[PDB]
Amino acid sequence: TARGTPSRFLASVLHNGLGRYVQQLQRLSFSVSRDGASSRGAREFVEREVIDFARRNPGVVIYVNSRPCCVPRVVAEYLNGAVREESIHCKSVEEISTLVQKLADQSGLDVIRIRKPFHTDNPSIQGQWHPFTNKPTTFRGLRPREVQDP
């Protein structure tokens, strides 16, 4: 639920997209098994998909380590320092490619509840409302039931 989980406001990293867009994904670490049956899709991704994916993302360093493992995993590290580990256990090549592409498009911020679906550092241009915004002034600023020059 929302009460039982943390929350945050919508934000970006270093005001990304304002002056220029910088891909927040920084590193991908794949762990595939040469003989593991659950790593069949992971091996298929490495054979034909990871090479083309590296061409399209020159700013992301991809490490493919082939070691014995029962559950293949991919570790995504972002510029802000967040580390996200995702399992590719018994996933097809298409599912892995969708998952890898999903990691590249994320900003690295925590995937939790966002209070407002918008953020603005300048919510007001004409001036934020205060109780005297629509109250006319009186001569000499006299309060109600006030006598002047007693």
Binding site: G127, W129, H130, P131, F132, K135, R143, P144
Partner: protein, 177 residues
């Protein structure tokens, strides 16, 4: 507004003292005006958890006017808890015993039935007559218009207004009247 962050927040959520004159005014209409201000419902920044209530000052609560025969028909009832302690008093009896009770009960019933209502009543100030404490007077901001227009008596009309209204019938010259 190019204000600093701390003063900008202080200005938006400041409390405003409102003055309301209850002479010849129905308590319910006074209560409806007071209830909105006490809850903060008159502000675009209103929210239940923002605690944006304002202070309402009502004077001349002794000189309120009840439409119809509500002075003799409206009954305010309460129980003291002890057996045989069910007390029912008319509006006339309660007004004489307490000049501010009638307006106070009307405002109290219009506020939300929650734990914020008693706080809102602490921002409500009632005075039976035109006397108001100097501290309360010095912090007033705006005087709300009276909800009901007080009709003028027959002797309050000027001669120009009396002459303006035409005579409608010609009485017989030999009628005693």
């Amino acid at each position: 507004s190019s204000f600093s962050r701390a003063p900008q927040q202080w200005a938006t959520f400041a409390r405003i003292w409102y003055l309301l004159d209850g002479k010849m005014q129905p308590p319910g209409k006074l209560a409806a005006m007071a209830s909105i201000r006490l809850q903060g419902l008159h502000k675009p920044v209103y929210h239940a958890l923002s605690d944006c209530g304002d202070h309402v000052v009502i004077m001349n609560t002794r000189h309120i006017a009840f439409s119809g025969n509500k002075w003799e028909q409206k009954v305010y009832s309460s129980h003291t808890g002890y057996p045989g302690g069910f007390r029912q008093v008319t509006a006339a009896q309660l007004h004489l015993r307490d000049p501010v009770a009638i307006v106070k009960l009307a405002i109290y019933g219009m506020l939300p039935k929650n734990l914020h209502r008693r706080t809102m009543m602490e921002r409500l100030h009632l005075f039976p007559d035109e006397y108001i404490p100097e501290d309360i007077l010095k912090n007033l901001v705006e005087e709300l218009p009276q909800p009901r227009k007080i009709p003028k008596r027959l002797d309050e009309y000027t001669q120009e207004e009396i002459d303006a209204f035409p005579r409608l019938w010609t009485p017989p010259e030999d009628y005693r009247l």
